[PDB]
Design a protein around this ligand. Structure first.
Ligand SMILES: CCCCCCCCCCCCCCCCCC(=O)OC[C@H](COP(=O)([O-])OCC(O)COP(=O)([O-])OC[C@@H](COC(=O)CCCCCCCCCCCCCCCCC)OC(=O)CCCCCCCCCCCCCCCCC)OC(=O)CCCCCCCCCCCCCCCCC
Ligand SMILES: CCCCCCCCCCCCCCCCCC(=O)OC[C@H](COP(=O)([O-])OCC[N+](C)(C)C)OC(=O)CCCCCCCCCCCCCCCCC
Ligand SMILES: CCCCCCCCCCCCCCCCCC(=O)OC[C@H](COP(=O)(O)OCCN)OC(=O)CCCCCCCCCCCCCCCCC
Ligand SMILES: CCCCCCCCCCCCCCCCCC(=O)OC[C@H](COP(=O)(O)OCCN)OC(=O)CCCCCCCCCCCCCCCCC
Ligand SMILES: CCCCCCCCCCCCCCCCCC(=O)OC[C@H](COP(=O)(O)OCCN)OC(=O)CCCCCCCCCCCCCCCCC
Ligand SMILES: CCCCCCCCCCCCCCCCCC(=O)OC[C@H](COP(=O)(O)OCCN)OC(=O)CCCCCCCCCCCCCCCCC
Ligand SMILES: CCCCCCCCCCCCCCCCCC(=O)OC[C@H](COP(=O)(O)OCCN)OC(=O)CCCCCCCCCCCCCCCCC
Ligand code: HEC
Ligand code: HEM
Ligand code: HEM
Ligand code: HEM
Ligand code: HEM
Lengths: 101, 60, 53, 77, 66, 380, 240, 55, 32, 109, 54
C-alpha cells in the first residue's frame, strides 16, 4: 500500500546500513548458501561488494557515516544476490528431499 | 637555534640504549619529584590532622 | 528438532539403530547401578544379595 | 588463515601517511563534539526508554514499599 | 556544662518541619493515651520527627565541636 | 639468516596468536574485554596467591587470618581489597563480554560460545567459594542457602549435600575443601580460556557490523596491543579508584562479623550477580522449580545459538531487536535490584514479572523480532 | 517494630576523598574507649603496636601497655601467671568467653568493637546516631529491665545503659568533655580501629589519581598516534 | 577372535573394577569423616530450664 | 590509466611544520 | 562427510600429538618414563588436592590435620601415603628419565 | 622465612608455593612436549628413525 512503502522507507533509514553505503544483500549474514551465492557472483558485482564492505569497515573504524547525498536509497537498492541465493536454496532443498527419499 | 624536541631526539631519543638510559634516569628523578610533590599536596590538604603534624606536643 | 530428518530413509536408520541404542542404554544403566552400588536395584539380583549392598 | 590468502580484492587503492607526519588529535573537539552528538542522536531512542522505565519502576517500588511500611489509620480502636 | 548538641537540637525543633512532625506527635499521643486498652502504637511519627530533626542537626552540628 | 619470530616454535605460536594475528580493524571498545578478562584473571591469580601465602583455612582462624592480612601484613589490606574489587571487576567485564556476544551475534561461533558458558559456570563457582572463604556471616549463610538450593533436587539432594558439606552443616571440612577448590579452579579457568582462545583463533574475531572482516584486516600489533594497553589502564583506574576510595560499596557490612551459626542476619544478600541469580531463584515459589529456573537462566546463553533465526548476524542493522536487547539489559538491572531487595510487596510481583519477561524476551520474542525484521526487509 | 530509622550523613572531617583522620580525636576516642567502653566491649584485633605511630608515641603507648595486666606462661611449674603487658600484646578482654558476657549483661553479647564501623550500615554515622539517640520510649510500648529504647537500633530495644554523658571522663588536652564530643571522638576512633589503613590508603589514592590523570592523556596519545595510520587512511575503487 | 577378545575383556573388567574402587574411595574421602559422624548422634542436653523457654 | 592515481589532500591532518609543500622536511623531522 | 579426528581443532591437536604421532618403532622401556612422569604428576595433583582438601596450614594444627587425615578421614591415610610414595617414585622415574637422556644422546635436543 | 626463622608465615607461604608449583610444572611440561614434537623423538640406536616409524 501507499502507507506500507513509507513505513518501509522509514524502517530502512532506521536500520542504518544505508548510512555506511551498504545494501541488504551485503548486510545479510554469510552462511553456507550465502557463501555459495558469493562464489557464484560475477566478477564486477563481487568487486563492488568487496569494496563496499571494505569502505564500511573503514567507516565503522572511524565511527563516521557517509554524507546524506552519498547514502544509498531505497529505490536503487538493487537485489543482486537474490536470484543466486534463491537458486542455491532451491538446489539445497532438492538435495534435502533426495536425502529424505 | 634548534628546537628542544629536535635536540632531545638528536642526543637521547635516537639510539635505543640512550633512550633507555634517559628513561631510567628520568624514572629515578621523576619518582623523587612526584614523591615530594604528592606528599606535600597531602599534608597541605591535611594540615593539623596528621600524626607528624600533632607530634610535637608528645615527644618533648 | 529439525525439518530435514523426516522421510523413509531416516526412519529406517532409526529402526536399524534402536536395538544398538537400547543396548547402549542398557549397559549405561548397568554401569550406573554397578558404579553407585544402588541397593534398590541390586537387592533383586540373586548373588549380589550376599554383598548386602 | 594468515595474511596473503584471506580475501580476493581487486582495484582498491589505499593512502596513508606517517604518524609522525600527521597529528594524533586532529581537531579533537570541533568535529569530535558533533560526531558524538550525532551518535547519541542516532542511538538514544533505543536505550533511554528502557532506562527510564527502570527509573520509573525503581521509584514506584520504593514509594509503594514505603507506603507498605506506612501506618494504616483505618484501625482506630 | 552547656551542650552544643542540645542547643542545635533545640534550634532544629524550632525549625518548622520538625514542629509539624512534633504536632503530629502530640495528636498521636493524645489519640493513643485517650484509650485504655489498644494494640496500636505510633513509633512511626516519632521516626519521622527524629529523621527530620537529626537531618537538620547533621547539617548544623559539627561547627561547635573541635 | 632467518626470522626467529616466525621460525622458533614458541615464538611462532606467539606470532600466530598475539603478534601477527589478523584482526578486524573496526572492532569497538567492547572487544577489549577479552583482554581485560585475561588480565583480571592474572591479577586474581597473583593476588590470591599472596592471600593464601598469608591465609589459613580453619574455622577458628579464618577470620583471624583475614584480619591479620588486613592489619599486620604489609599492604595486605591492599591485597585483600584488590582481590575483592578485582572479582567485582572480573564480573563486570564478564557481563560486558557476554553482552557484546549477545548484541553482535558472536554466539554463532558455537564451540567458543559453549566454552565461554563453561567458563562462566566455573567463574560463578570460584567466586562463590571465594566469598565463602573469609568465614563471615554472609559467607556461612550464603553457603547454607545455596547448598539447600542444591538439596532441592529429589532423591539425591540430601546425599549430595551431605557429601559437599563434609558432614551435616557448613563446617571445617566445608571451609577447607572450599579453600582447595577456590584455589585450584582458576587454573582450570585458565586452561579453558586457552581452549576458548584456540576455538576463537580457528575462525577469527568478529566485527561490530557482523560482516566478513577479511576485506579490511590489520595485524594485532601494534594497533590492538596499544588499544588493549589503554583498556588495561582504564580498567586499573576504575579498579583501584574503587579499592582506594570505596572499597566497601560493593561488599557487605555484616560480612565483617564472625560467622555465628546460631545467629542469623535480618537479610540475605550475596554479591550483585548472585542477587540476579537469587531473584530468578525466588521468583518461582517452589524449590525444584526455582533451581531449574536458575540453571535454565544460565543455560539459555548456550541455547541462544540455536535461537538465531535472523538473516543478519549483528544487531547493528536491526533496530527492533536493539529495543528488545536493551529491554533485556533493563530487566537484568531490575532483577539485580529485586535480588537486592527483601521479598515483600511489591518486590515479589515485580520480580515475578521481571523473571517471566526475561525468559519470554530471550526465548520467544527475539526470534519473532528477527523474523519480523526479515519480513520488513523483504527477506522472507 | 519492623521499621528502622536511617542515620543521617554527618559531615566528618574524613568524609572527603583526600581528607585524612584527625589523630587528636583518635587518641581522645582511645581514652574514651579505655575508661568508658572497655568494661563491656572488647577489641580482639587492635594492639598497642598499632597505637604506636597513629595515636600515641612509642613511650606513651608502652606505658599504657604496662598499665594493664596480661595472663601469660607457663612458669616453671607449668602454671599461668600475671605479667605486665607490652607493646606486642592486644587489648585485654573483659570476659574470657561470650557466655560470661551473656551472664553479666543480661543475655546480651556486646560484639567486638574492631570491625563495628565496617560491620554496621552507615558506620561511624550509625555509631554516632546510636550513642546520641537515647530517648524515652513513645507511649504504649513497654520494655523490661535491662532494655532501653533507641530509634536507630534494629528492633528499637537495645540492652545498653546510656554509656556516655557530659563530663563522663576527663580529657588530656583540655577539650570540653560534652556528650557529643565524646561520641564524635569514640566514633572516629572506632573508624580508625575498623580501618587503620585510612590515611595511607587515601595518600595512595591521591598518588594513583595524579599518575592516572597524567598517564591516560599520554597513553591515549600513543593510541591515537599508532592508530593515525588507519584513522586518516583513504580508500579508492578503480574498476576498469 | 574369541580368545583374544576374552583376554581384552577380562583386562577391561579388571581395570574397571580397580578404577571404580579407587574413585569410590576418593568420593568416600570427600564424604563425612569419623569426627563428624561421632559428634552427630549424641547431644548433651539436660532439663534444667523452666517452662516457656527455648534453647 | 595509472597516472590518474593522485594522492588526495591530507592537510586536515598534517602537523604544523608540514602543511606547506614548498618547504622541505628534515628541518622538522627531528622535532616531530 | 569429513574426518572429525583430524578436522576438529582440539581433536586434530590430540591426534597430531598423541594418536598419529610418528614415533620410532624401536624405543625400549626406558622411553615409557616420560608418560610415567606425566601420570605421576596427574596422580600427585589429585592426591595432593585431596590432602589440601582435608589439610590446614598452621603450625598449631598442621600435625593435627595430618593425624586427622591419617585416622578420621575415610582412606585419608591411603591418599597421604599414596602422595608420599608417588613423590618418591616420581623422583625415581625422573632419575631414569635423566639417565636415558645422558645414555641415549637425548641432550642434542 | 617471612621473619627470622621457619614459623607460621613460612609454613603458610610454603603451602601456597607447594600448591601452585605443580601447575607451573604442567605448563612447562606442555612446553617440553611442544619442543619435543617440534624436534622429533629419539631412538636407542641414536640414528635417524625416519626410515621405520609406527
Ligand atoms: C567528550 C569530549 C571529547 C570528544 O568529543 O572526543 C571525541 C572522541 C571520539 O572521537 P571520534 O573521532 O568520533 O572517534 C575516534 C576515537 O577518538 C578513537 O579513540 P577511541 O575513543 O575509540 O579509543 C578507544 C577507547 C578504549 O577504551 C577502552 O578500552 C576502555 C574499556 C572499557 C573501560 C574499562 C572496563 C571497566 C568498565 C567499568 C564501568 O578509548 C577511549 O574511549 C578513550 C579514553 C580516554 C580516557 C581519558 C583521556 C583524557 O571521544 C572519545 O574518544 C571519548 C573518550 C574521551 C573523551
Ligand atoms: C549421581 C549421584 C550418585 C549418588 C550416589 O552414589 O548415591 C548413593 C546411592 C547408593 O544406593 P542406595 O540404594 O544405598 O541409596 C539410595 C537411597 N538414598 C540415596 C536416599 C540414600 O546411589 C544412588 O542413590 C544411585 C543414584 C542414581 C541416579
Ligand atoms: C551502557 C550504554 C552503552 C551504549 O551506548 O550502547 C549503545 C551502543 C550502540 O552501538 P551500535 O548500535 O552497535 O552502533 C555503534 C555506532 N553505530 O551499543 C553498543 O555499543 C553495544 C553494547 C553491547 C554490550 C552491552 C552490555 C551491557 C551490559 C549487559 C549485562 C548483561 C548481559 C547478559 C548477562 C546474562
Ligand atoms: C558424584 C558424587 C555423588 C555423591 O554425592 O556421592 C557421595 C556418596 C557418599 O557415599 P558414602 O560415603 O557411602 O555415604 C553414605 C551414603 N551413600 O558416594 C557414593 O555413594 C559413592 C559413589 C561412587 C561412584 C563410582 C563411579 C565409578 C566409575 C567407574 C568408571 C570405570
Ligand atoms: C514508531 C516510532 C516513530 C518515531 C519517529 C521519530 C522521528 C523519526 C524521523 C527522524 C529521525 C530521528 C532519528 C532516528 C533514529 C533511529 C530510528 C528510531 O529511533 O526509530 C524509533 C525506534 C525504532 O523503531 P521500531 O523499532 O520500528 O519500533 C517498533 C516499536 N516496538 O523506536 C523507538 O525509539 C521506540 C522505543 C519504545 C520502547 C518502549 C519499551 C517499553 C517497555 C520497556 C520494558 C523494560 C523492562 C521493564 C520490566 C518488565 C517486567 C516488570
Ligand atoms: C589398575 C591398577 C590397579 C589394580 C590393582 C588394584 C585393584 C583393586 O581395586 O583392588 C581393590 C582394593 C580395595 O579393596 P577394598 O577396600 O576391599 O574394596 C572393597 C570395598 N567396596 O584397591 C586398593 O587397594 C587400591 C589400589 C589402587 C591402585 C590404582 C591407583 C590408581 C590411581 C589413579
Ligand atoms: C640400571 C641397571 C642396569 C640396567 C641395564 O640393563 O643397563 C644396561 C642397558 C644396556 O642397554 P643398551 O646399551 O641400549 O643395549 C642395547 C643393545 N642391543 O643400559 C641402559 O639401559 C642404559 C640406560 C640406563 C638408565 C638408568 C640408569 C641410570 C639411572 C640414574 C641416572 C642419574 C642421572 C643423574 C641424576 C641426578 C642429576
Ligand atoms: C556495658 C554496659 C557496655 C558499655 C559500657 C558499652 N557497651 Fe555498647 N554493647 C553492650 C551490649 C550489652 C550490646 C548488645 C546489646 C544488644 O541489644 O544487642 C552492645 C552492642 C553495641 C553495638 C552494636 C549495636 C548494633 O546495632 O549491632 C554498638 C555499636 C555499641 N555497643 C557501641 C558502644 C560504644 C561505642 C561504647 C563506648 C562509648 C559502648 N557501646 C559501651 C554493652 C556495652
Ligand atoms: C571467563 C573467562 C573468559 C575469558 C578469559 C575469555 C577470553 C576471551 C578473549 C581473550 C577473547 C578475545 C577478545 C575478543 O574477541 O573480544 C574472547 C572472545 C570471545 N568470547 Fe570470551 N572469555 C571468557 C568468557 C566468555 C563468556 C562467558 C562468553 C559467552 C557467554 C565468551 C564468549 C566469547 C566469544 C563468542 C568471543 C568471540 C568474540 C568475537 O568473535 O568478536 N567468553 N574471549
Ligand atoms: C589462583 C586464583 C585464586 C586464588 C589463589 C584465590 C584465593 C583466595 C583467598 C585465599 C581468599 C580469602 C582471602 C580473603 O577473602 O581475605 C579469596 C577470596 C575471594 N576470592 Fe579468590 N582466589 C583466586 C581467584 C579468584 C577468582 C578468579 C575470583 C572471581 C572471579 C575470586 C573471587 C574471590 C572473592 C569474591 C573472594 C572474597 C572477597 C571478599 O569476601 O571480600 N578469586 N580468594
Ligand atoms: C618433570 C616432568 C617431565 C615430564 C612430564 C616430561 C615429559 C616427557 C615425555 C612425555 C617425553 C616423551 C617420552 C620419551 O621421549 O621418552 C619426554 C622426553 C624427553 N624428556 Fe622429559 N619430562 C620431564 C622431565 C624431564 C627432565 C628432568 C629432562 C632432562 C634432564 C627431560 C628431558 C627429556 C628429553 C631430552 C626427552 C626426549 C627423549 C627422546 O626423544 O627420546 N625431561 N619427556
Ligand atoms: C596440585 C598438586 C599438589 C598438591 C595440592 C599437593 C599438596 C600437598 C599437601 C597438602 C601435602 C601435605 C600432606 C602431607 O605432608 O602428607 C603434601 C605433601 C607432600 N607433597 Fe604434595 N602436592 C602436590 C603435588 C606434589 C608434587 C608434584 C610433588 C613432588 C614433586 C609433591 C611432593 C610432596 C611430598 C614429598 C610431600 C611430603 C609428604 C610426606 O613427607 O609425608 N607433591 N602435598
Amino acid at each position: 500500500s501507499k502507507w506500507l512503502d513509507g513505513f518501509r522507507k522509514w524502517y530502512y533509514n532506521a536500520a542504518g546500513f544505508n548510512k555506511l553505503g551498504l545494501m541488504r544483500d551485503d548486510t545479510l549474514h554469510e552462511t553456507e548458501d550465502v557463501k555459495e551465492a558469493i562464489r557464484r557472483l560475477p566478477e564486477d558485482l563481487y568487486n563492488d561488494r568487496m569494496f563496499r564492505i571494505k569502505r564500511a569497515l573503514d567507516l565503522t573504524m572511524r565511527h563516521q557515516i557517509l554524507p546524506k547525498d552519498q547514502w544509498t536509497k531505497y529505490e536503487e537498492d538493487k537485489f543482486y544476490l537474490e536470484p543466486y541465493l534463491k537458486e542455491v536454496i532451491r538446489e539445497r532443498k532438492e538435495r534435502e528431499e533426495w536425502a529424505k527419499k | 637555534s634548534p628546537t628542544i624536541p629536535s635536540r632531545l631526539y638528536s642526543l637521547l631519543f635516537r639510539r635505543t640504549s640512550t633512550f633507555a638510559l634517559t628513561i631510567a634516569v628520568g624514572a629515578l628523578f621523576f619518582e623523587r619529584a612526584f614523591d615530594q610533590g604528592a606528599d606535600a599536596i597531602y599534608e597541605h590538604i591535611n594540615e593539623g590532622k596528621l600524626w607528624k603534624h600533632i607530634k610535637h606536643k608528645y615527644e618533648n | 528438532m529439525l525439518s530435514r530428518f523426516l522421510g523413509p530413509r531416516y526412519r529406517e536408520l532409526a529402526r536399524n539403530w534402536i536395538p544398538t541404542a537400547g543396548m547402549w542404554g542398557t549397559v549405561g544403566a548397568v554401569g550406573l547401578v554397578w558404579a553407585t552400588d544402588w541397593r534398590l536395584i541390586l537387592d533383586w539380583v540373586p548373588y549380589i544379595n550376599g554383598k548386602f549392598k | 588463515r594468515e595474511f596473503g590468502n584471506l580475501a580476493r580484492i581487486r582495484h582498491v587503492i589505499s593512502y596513508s601517511l606517517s604518524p609522525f607526519e600527521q597529528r594524533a588529535f586532529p581537531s579533537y573537539f570541533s568535529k569530535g563534539i558533533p560526531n558524538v552528538l550525532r551518535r547519541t542522536r542516532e542511538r538514544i531512542l533505543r536505550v533511554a526508554p528502557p532506562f527510564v522505565v527502570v527509573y520509573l519502576i525503581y521509584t514506584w517500588g520504593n514509594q509503594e514499599f514505603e507506603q507498605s511500611k506506612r501506618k494504616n489509620p483505618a484501625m482506630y480502636e | 556544662l552547656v551542650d552544643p548538641l542540645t542547643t542545635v537540637r533545640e534550634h532544629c525543633e524550632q525549625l518548622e518541619k520538625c514542629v509539624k512532625a512534633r504536632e503530629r506527635l502530640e495528636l498521636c499521643d493524645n489519640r493513643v493515651s485517650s484509650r485504655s486498652q489498644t494494640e496500636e502504637d505510633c513509633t512511626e511519627e516519632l521516626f519521622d520527627f527524629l529523621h527530620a530533626r537529626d537531618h537538620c542537626v547533621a547539617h548544623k552540628l559539627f561547627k561547635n565541636l573541635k | 639468516m632467518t626470522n626467529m619470530r616466525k621460525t622458533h616454535p614458541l615464538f611462532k605460536i606467539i606470532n600466530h596468536s598475539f603478534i601477527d594475528l589478523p584482526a578486524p580493524s573496526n572492532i569497538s571498545s567492547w572487544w577489549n574485554f577479552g583482554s581485560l578478562l585475561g588480565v583480571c584473571l592474572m591479577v586474581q591469580i597473583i593476588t590470591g596467591l599472596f592471600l593464601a601465602m598469608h591465609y589459613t583455612s580453619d574455622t577458628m582462624t579464618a577470620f583471624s587470618s583475614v584480619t591479620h592480612i588486613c592489619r599486620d601484613v604489609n599492604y595486605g589490606w591492599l591485597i585483600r581489597y584488590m582481590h575483592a574489587n578485582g572479582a567485582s571487576m572480573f564480573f563486570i567485564c564478564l557481563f560486558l563480554h557476554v553482552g557484546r556476544g549477545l548484541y553482535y551475534g558472536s554466539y554463532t561461533f558455537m564451540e567458543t560460545w559453549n566454552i565461554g558458558v563453561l567458563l562462566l559456570f566455573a567463574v560463578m563457582a570460584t567466586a562463590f567459594m571465594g566469598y565463602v572463604l573469609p568465614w563471615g556471616q554472609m559467607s556461612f549463610w550464603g553457603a547454607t542457602v545455596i547448598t539447600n538450593l542444591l538439596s532441592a533436587i529429589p532423591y539425591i539432594g540430601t546425599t549430595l549435600v551431605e557429601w559437599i558439606w563434609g558432614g551435616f552443616s557448613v563446617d571445617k571440612a566445608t571451609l577447607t575443601r572450599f579453600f582447595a577448590f577456590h584455589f585450584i579452579l582458576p587454573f582450570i579457568i585458565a586452561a579453558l580460556a586457552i581452549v576458548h582462545l584456540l576455538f576463537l583463533h580457528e575462525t577469527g574475531s568478529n566485527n561490530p557490523t557482523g560482516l566478513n572482516s577479511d576485506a579490511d584486516k590489520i595485524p594485532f600489533h601494534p594497533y590492538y596491543t596499544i588499544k588493549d594497553i589503554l583498556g588495561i589502564l582504564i580498567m586499573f583506574l576504575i579498579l583501584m579508584t574503587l579499592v582506594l576510595f570505596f572499597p566497601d560499596m560493593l561488599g557487605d557490612p555484616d560480612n565483617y562479623m564472625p560467622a555465628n551459626p546460631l545467629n542469623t542476619p535480618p537479610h540475605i544478600k550475596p554479591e550483585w550477580y548472585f542477587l540476579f541469580a537469587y531473584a530468578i531463584l525466588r521468583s518461582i515459589p517452589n524449590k525444584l522449580g526455582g533451581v531449574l529456573a536458575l540453571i535454565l537462566s544460565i543455560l539459555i546463553l548456550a541455547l541462544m545459538p540455536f535461537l538465531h533465526t535472523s538473516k543478519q548476524r549483528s544487531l547493528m542493522f536491526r533496530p527492533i531487536t536493539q529495543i528488545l536487547y536493551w529491554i533485556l539489559v533493563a530487566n537484568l538491572l531490575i532483577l539485580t535490584w529485586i535480588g537486592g531487595q527483601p521479598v515483600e510487596h511489591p518486590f515479589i510481583i515485580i520480580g515475578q514479572l521481571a523473571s517471566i519477561s526475561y525468559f519470554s524476551i530471550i526465548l520467544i520474542l527475539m526470534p519473532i523480532s528477527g523474523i519480523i525484521e526479515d519480513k520488513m526487509l523483504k527477506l522472507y | 517494630s519492623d521499621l528502622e530509622l536511617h542515620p543521617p550523613s554527618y559531615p566528618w572531617s574524613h568524609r572527603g576523598l583526600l581528607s585524612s583522620l584527625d589523630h587528636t580525636s583518635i587518641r581522645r576516642g582511645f581514652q574514651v574507649y579505655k575508661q568508658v567502653c572497655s568494661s563491656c566491649h572488647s577489641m580482639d584485633y587492635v594492639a598497642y603496636r598499632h597505637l604506636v605511630g597513629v595515636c600515641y608515641t612509642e613511650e606513651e603507648a608502652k606505658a599504657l601497655a604496662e598499665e594493664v595486666e596480661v595472663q601469660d606462661g607457663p612458669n616453671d611449674d607449668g602454671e599461668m601467671f600475671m605479667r605486665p603487658g607490652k607493646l606486642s600484646d592486644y587489648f585485654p578482654k573483659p570476659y574470657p568467653n561470650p557466655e560470661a558476657a551473656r551472664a553479666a549483661n543480661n543475655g546480651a553479647l556486646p560484639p567486638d568493637l574492631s570491625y563495628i564501623v565496617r560491620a554496621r550500615h552507615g558506620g561511624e554515622d550509625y555509631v554516632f546516631s546510636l550513642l546520641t539517640g537515647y530517648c524515652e520510649p513513645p507511649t504504649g510500648v513497654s520494655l523490661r529491665e535491662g532494655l532501653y529504647f533507641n530509634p536507630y537500633f534494629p528492633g528499637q530495644a537495645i540492652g545498653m545503659a546510656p554509656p556516655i554523658y557530659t563530663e563522663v571522663l576527663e580529657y588530656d588536652d583540655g577539650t570540653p568533655a560534652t556528650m557529643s564530643q565524646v561520641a564524635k571522638d569514640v566514633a572516629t576512633f572506632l573508624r580508625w580501629a575498623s580501618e587503620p589503613e585510612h590515611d595511607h590508603r587515601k595518600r595512595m589514592g591521591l598518588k594513583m589519581l595524579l599518575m592516572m590523570g597524567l598517564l591516560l592523556p599520554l597513553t591515549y596519545a600513543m593510541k591515537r598516534h599508532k592508530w593515525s595510520v588507519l584513522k586518516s587512511r583513504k580508500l579508492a575503487y578503480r574498476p576498469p | 577372535k574369541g580368545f583374544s577378545y576374552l583376554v581384552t575383556a577380562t583386562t577391561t573388567v579388571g581395570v574397571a573394577y580397580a578404577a571404580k574402587n579407587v574413585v569410590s574411595q576418593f568420593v568416600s574421602s570427600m564424604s563425612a569423616s569419623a569426627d563428624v559422624l561421632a559428634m552427630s548422634k549424641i547431644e548433651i542436653k539436660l532439663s534444667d530450664i523452666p517452662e516457656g523457654k527455648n534453647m | 590509466s595509472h597516472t590518474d592515481v593522485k594522492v588526495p589532500d591530507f592537510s586536515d591532518y598534517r602537523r604544523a611544520e608540514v602543511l606547506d609543500s614548498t618547504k622541505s622536511s628534515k628541518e622538522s623531522s627531528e622535532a616531530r
